[PDB]
Amino acid sequence: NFMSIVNCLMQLRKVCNHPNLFEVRPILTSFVLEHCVASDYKDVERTLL
Amino acid sequence: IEGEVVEIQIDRSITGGHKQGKLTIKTTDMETIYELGNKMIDGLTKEKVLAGDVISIDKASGKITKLGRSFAFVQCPEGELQKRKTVVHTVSLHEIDVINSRTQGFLALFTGDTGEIRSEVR
Amino acid sequence: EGPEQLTSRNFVTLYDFPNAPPNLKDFNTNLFGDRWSYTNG
Amino acid sequence: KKMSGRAILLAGGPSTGKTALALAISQELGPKVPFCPLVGSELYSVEVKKTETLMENFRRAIGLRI
Amino acid sequence: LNDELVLHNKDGFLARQEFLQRVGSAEDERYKELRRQQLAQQLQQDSEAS
Amino acid sequence: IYIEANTGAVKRVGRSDAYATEFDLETEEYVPLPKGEVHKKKEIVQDVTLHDLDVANARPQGGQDVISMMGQLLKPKKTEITEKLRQEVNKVVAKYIDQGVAELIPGVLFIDEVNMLDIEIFTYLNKALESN
Amino acid sequence: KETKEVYEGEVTELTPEDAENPLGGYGKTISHVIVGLKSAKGTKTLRLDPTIYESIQREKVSIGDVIYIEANTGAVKRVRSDAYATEFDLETEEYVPLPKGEVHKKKEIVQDVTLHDLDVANARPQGGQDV
Amino acid sequence: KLNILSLDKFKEQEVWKKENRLALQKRQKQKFQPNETILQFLSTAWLMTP
Amino acid sequence: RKIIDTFAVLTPSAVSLDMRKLALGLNDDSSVGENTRLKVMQNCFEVSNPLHQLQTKLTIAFPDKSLLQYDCGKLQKLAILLQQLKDNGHRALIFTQMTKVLDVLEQFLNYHGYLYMRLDGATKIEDRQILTERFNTDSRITVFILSSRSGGLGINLTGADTVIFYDSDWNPAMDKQCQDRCHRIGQTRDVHIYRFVSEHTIESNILKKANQKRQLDNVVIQEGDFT
Numbered sequence: 032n033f034m035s036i037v038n039c040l041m042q043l044r045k046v047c048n049h050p051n052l053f054e055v056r057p058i059l060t061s062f063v064l065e066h067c068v069a070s071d072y073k074d075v076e077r078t079l080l
Numbered sequence: 081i082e083g084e085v086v087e088i089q090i091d092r093s094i095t096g097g098h099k100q101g102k103l104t105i106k107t108t109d110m111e112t113i114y115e116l117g118n119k120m121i122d123g124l125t126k127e128k129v130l131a132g133d134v135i136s137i138d139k140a141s142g143k144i145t146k147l148g149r150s151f152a153f154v155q156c157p158e159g160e161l162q163k164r165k166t167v168v169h170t171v172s173l174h175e176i177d178v179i180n181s182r183t184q185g186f187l188a189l190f191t192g193d194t195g196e197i198r199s200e201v202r
Numbered sequence: 203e204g205p206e207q208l209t210s211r212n213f214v215t216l217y218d219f220p221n222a223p224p225n226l227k228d229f230n231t232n233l234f235g236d237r238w239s240y241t242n243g
Numbered sequence: 244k245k246m247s248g249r250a251i252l253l254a255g256g257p258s259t260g261k262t263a264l265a266l267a268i269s270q271e272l273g274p275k276v277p278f279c280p281l282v283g284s285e286l287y288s289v290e291v292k293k294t295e296t297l298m299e300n301f302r303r304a305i306g307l308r309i
Numbered sequence: 310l311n312d313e314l315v316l317h318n319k320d321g322f323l324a325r326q327e328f329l330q331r332v333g334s335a336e337d338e339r340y341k342e343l344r345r346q347q348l349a350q351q352l353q354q355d356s357e358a359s
Numbered sequence: 360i361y362i363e364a365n366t367g368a369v370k371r372v373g374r375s376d377a378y379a380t381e382f383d384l385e386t387e388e389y390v391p392l393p394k395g396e397v398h399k400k401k402e403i404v405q406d407v408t409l410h411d412l413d414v415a416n417a418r419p420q421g422g423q424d425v426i427s428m429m430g431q432l433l434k435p436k437k438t439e440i441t442e443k444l445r446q447e448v449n450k451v452v453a454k455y456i457d458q459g460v461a462e463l464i465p466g467v468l469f470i471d472e473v474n475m476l477d478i479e480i481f482t483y484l485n486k487a488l489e490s491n
Numbered sequence: 492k493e494t495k496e497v498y499e500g501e502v503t504e505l506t507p508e509d510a511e512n513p514l515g516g517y518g519k520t521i522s523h524v525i526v527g528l529k530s531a532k533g534t535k536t537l538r539l540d541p542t543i544y545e546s547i548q549r550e551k552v553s554i555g556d557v558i559y560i561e562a563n564t565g566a567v568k569r570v571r572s573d574a575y576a577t578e579f580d581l582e583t584e585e586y587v588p589l590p591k592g593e594v595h596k597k598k599e600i601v602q603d604v605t606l607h608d609l610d611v612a613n614a615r616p617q618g619g620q621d622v
Numbered sequence: 623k624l625n626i627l628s629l630d631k632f633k634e635q636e637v638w639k640k641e642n643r644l645a646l647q648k649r650q651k652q653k654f655q656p657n658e659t660i661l662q663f664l665s666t667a668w669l670m671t672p
Numbered sequence: 673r674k675i676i677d678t679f680a681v682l683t684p685s686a687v688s689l690d691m692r693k694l695a696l697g698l699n700d701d702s703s704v705g706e707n708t709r710l711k712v713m714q715n716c717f718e719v720s721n722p723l724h725q726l727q728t729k730l731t732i733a734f735p736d737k738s739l740l741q742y743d744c745g746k747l748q749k750l751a752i753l754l755q756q757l758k759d760n761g762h763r764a765l766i767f768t769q770m771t772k773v774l775d776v777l778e779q780f781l782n783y784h785g786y787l788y789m790r791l792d793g794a795t796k797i798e799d800r801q802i803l804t805e806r807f808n809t810d811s812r813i814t815v816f817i818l819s820s821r822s823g824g825l826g827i828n829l830t831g832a833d834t835v836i837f838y839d840s841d842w843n844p845a846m847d848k849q850c851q852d853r854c855h856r857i858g859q860t861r862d863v864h865i866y867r868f869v870s871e872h873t874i875e876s877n878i879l880k881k882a883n884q885k886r887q888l889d890n891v892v893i894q895e896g897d898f899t
C-alpha cells in the first residue's frame with residue numbers, strides 16, 4: 032500500500048533498544064506433537080485379548 | 081564469608097517442625113552476628129561446628145568448609161568478614177557432549193557405558 | 203585459651219519439666235521399653 | 244522443492260574441490276534448509292543394521308517448519 | 310561482515326513473520342469458509358421449513 | 360514458579376523478593392514477582408525434522424516425572440524403527456501441512472568417500488532412492 | 492594400615508550432670524555426661540560432651556547390655572550380654588560376653604586392596620531403593 | 623495566612639508520608655514464632671575461662 | 673552440582689505425551705491389573721530420585737539473565753557510565769522517546785540493584801508532583817528516568833548533576849528543554865550531559881540535523897537591552 036517513515040522509525044527502534052520490541056530470547060521447550068498412535072491400536076488390542 | 085566461630089545458639093522444638101538458630105562470627109577487624117533460616121541449621125549440624133573452629137561459608141551454595149580448630153593449629157582469619165573470588169570450571173567438549181545425550185548419560189562419564197551419541201547433539 | 207576437650211552446654215525450654223529431665227526421661231523409657239516400664243513395678 | 248530422490252555424484256582426483264563444492268552448495272542453500280553430511284564409514288554401527296542407519300539419515304535429511 | 314549477514318538474512322527474521330501471517334490468513338480463510346457454509350445450511354433449512 | 364501448560368514442565372524460579380529479610384545469611388536467592396497477568400499465550404515457529412518427531416514417539420525423553428524417568432531408563436539402546444511408525448508419521452505430517460499450519464522443506468544428504476560402502480548398502484540405497 | 496582408640500565394655504551407669512547455664516536462663520543445663528564402663532579386670536568412669544546425647548538416643552543403648560565407642564570422632568555403636576542372657580525366658584536379642592582386658596584399647600588394623608577393586612567400586616553403584 | 627498554613631500542612635503531611643513508609647518498610651514479617659508452649663531443646667557451644 | 677548446572681543445556685526437539693506413561697503400561701486402560709498398577713506407582717512415588725535436577729535442567733531451559741546487558745550496544749556503555757557515576761556519588765536523569773524503552777531500562781536497573789524512579793505521561797498528577805518533590809530531596813535514589821515529553825518541559829529537578837540522552841528526538845528545541853531541567857538556578861555543581869549515538873547508524877545523521885538548528889538560534893536572537 033505505502034510505507035516510508037516506518038522504515039526510519041523502526042530502524043531508530045533497533046538502534047536504540049536492540050534485542051527486543053519483536054522477540055526476546057525464549058524459554059526453550061520441546062514440541063508437543065499430540066496425535067499419538069497408542070489410542071488407535073488400543074481398541075484392536077483390547078478386542079484381541 | 082570466612083572467620084572463626086565465636087558463638088552459636090541453636091533451638092530445637094521437640095515434635096516441632098521449625099528450629100531457631102543464631103551465631104556470632106568474627107575476624108581480626110570485624111565481629112557480627114547472624115540468624116539462620118531452615119537449611120542453614122541442618123547444613124551446620126551434619127558437620128559438627130563448635131566454638132573453636134574456623135569456618136568458610138558460600139552464600140550461593142551453603143557449603144560447609146572447615147579450615148581447622150584454632151584452640152581447644154591455625155591462625156585466626158584476618159581482614160574483612162566477607163570476600164569475593166573467582167573459580168574456573170574446566171571440562172572437555174566430549175564431557176559436555178556426553179552429559180546432554182541422555183538423562184543417565186552423566187553416569188557414563190565414569191562407567192564409560194555410552195553408545196553412539198546422536199549427531200544432532202554434537 | 204585451648205584447654206581440655208572443648209566445652210558445650212545443653213538446656214531445656216520453657217522453664218517447665220513435666221517429669222524429671224525429659225531427655226533422661228526418654229532415656230529411661232528406652233532403657234527397658236514402654237511395656238517393660240509398665241511391668242517394672 | 245518438487246523432485247524427490249535425485250542423485251548426483253561428483254568424481255575427480257584428490258585435491259580438486261569435491262568436498263569444497265559440497266560445502267559451498269550447503270552454504271549457498273542457507274541455514275533454513277537441512278543439510279546432513281556423512282562419510283561412508285558411519286553406516287557401520289553396532290546396535291542397529293546398516294540399512295536402518297541409512298534410513299535414519301534419510302529421515303534426518305528433510306525438515307518441517309511448524 | 311557481508312557473507313554472514315547475507316546467510317542470516319537468507320534465514321531472515323521477517324521470513325518468520327511472513328510465515329506466521331500466511332498461517333494466520335490460512336486459518337482465517339478456513340474460519341470464513343466454515344461460517345459461510347454454516348450460514349448457507351441455516352438459510353436452506355429455513356427456506357425448506359417455510 | 361513458572362509452569363508450562365503444553366508440556367507440564369515445572370521450574371521453581373526462586374523465593375519471592377517480598378520475604379527478603381528472614382535470615383542474615385540466607386542461602387536462597389530472591390526474585391521479583393513476574394510482570395503481567397498470570398496466564399500468557401505465545402506463538403512460535405520452531406522448526407523440526409522428520410526423524411526428530413519419528414524418534415519422539417519411537418523412544419521418549421520425557422522429563423521431570425519419576426515414572427517417565429524410569430521408563431526412559433528401562434531401554435538405553437536404539438533400535439530399528441518399523442515402517443508402520445514412519446507411515447503414521449507421514450500421515451500426521453500430511454494432515455498438519457494440509458491444515459495450513461506447517462510447511463515442508465526437503466534437504467540434502469552428502470556422503471563423502473562412497474567407495475567405503477559395500478554391495479548390500481549400495482543395493483539398499485538403490486531401492487530406497489525410488490521412494491516418494 | 493591405621494590405628495583406632497576404642498572404649499568398649501558393659502555399661503555400669505549413665506547420668507547427665509546438671510550445671511549452671513552459661514547464659515541467662517531458667518532451666519536445667521547439662522554440661523557433661525558421666526558413663527561408667529566395666530569389662531574383664533577393668534572399670535572406668537568417663538565424663539563426655541553432652542552433645543553426644545543423640546548418639547545414645549539413636550542407638551537404643553539401654554543400660555548394662557553392651558557399648559563400644561570410638562575416641563575422637565564421637566558417636567556410639569551398640570554391639571545384650573551373657574550376664575542377662577539366661578535371665579529372660581526367651582528373647583530374640585543377641586548376647587555378647589564381657590570384653591576382655593582394659594576398657595581403653597589401642598587397635599591397629601591393616602588390609603590390602605588392589606587398584607582394580609577401587610576402580611570397580613568407584614564405578615559400580617550401591618545403596619537400597621534408589622532408581 | 624491560610625495559604626501559608628496550607629503549605630505548612632503540606633510539609634507535615636509529606637513528613638507523615640515519609641514516616642509512614644519508613645514504618646511500613648521496617649515492619650517486615652519477622653513473626654514466625656516457631657516456638658509455641660512445648661518442650662524445646664537448646665544447644666550452645668562456647669569456651670569460657672575466667 | 674555446579675558442573676551439572678553449568679553444562680546441561682540441550683532439550684529434546686520434539687516430545688509426545690501419552691507415550692511416557694504408555695511405555696510402562698501404567699495408564700487408564702491397559703492389560704495390567706487395575707489395582708496392580710496402583711501398587712507399583714505408589715512404590716515408585718515412594719522411591720527417591722537422585723537425578724531429578726538433571727531431569728529439570730534437560731527439559732526446560734532459561735535464556736540466562738546477564739545477556740540483556742550484553743546484547744545491546746548502548747546498555748554496556750550505560751552500565752559503565754552509571755557505575756563510574758555512582759562510585760563518585762552523583763545522580764542522573766535519563767531521557768528517552770519510547771515508552772517501551774522505559775521498562776526495558778527498569779528490568780536492567782533492577783538487575784544492577786540501583787535505586788531509581790520513573791515519570792511518564794501515564795502517571796497521575798498528584799503522584800507526579802510527590803515523585804518530583806521526593807526526588808528533589810533525598811540522596812539514596814540514584815537515577816530518574818523521564819519521558820521526553822511529559823517530563824521534558826518546565827521542571828525543577830536540581831539534585832541530579834548528570835543528564836543522559838538515550839535517544840534523540842529530531843528537532844533540538846525539545847532536547848535543549850530536556851537538558852535544562854537540571855541546571856536552571858539552584859544547580860551548585862557542574863552539569864554533565866551525555867548523548868548516546870551509535871556509530872555507522874541512522875541515528876548519527878538525525879543528530880546532525882539537530883545541531884544545525886541549534887546554531888540557527890545563535891544567529892537569530894539578538895534582542896535584550898538596546899543601545
Ligand SMILES: Nc1ncnc2c1ncn2[C@@H]1O[C@H](COP(=O)(O)OP(=O)(O)O)[C@@H](O)[C@H]1O
Nearest residue numbers: 255256257258259260261262263264265266471
Ligand atoms: N577452486 C578452489 N578455490 C580454492 N580452494 C580450493 C579450490 N578447489 C579446491 N580447493 C582446496 O583444495 C582442498 C581439497 O579440497 P576437498 O574437496 O576438501 O578435497 P578433494 O578436493 O581432494 O576432494 C581444500 O582444502 C580446498 O580448500
Ligand SMILES: [Mg+2]
Nearest residue numbers: 258260261262
Ligand atoms: Mg576431498
Ligand SMILES: [Mg+2]
Nearest residue numbers: 825826827828
Ligand atoms: Mg517555565
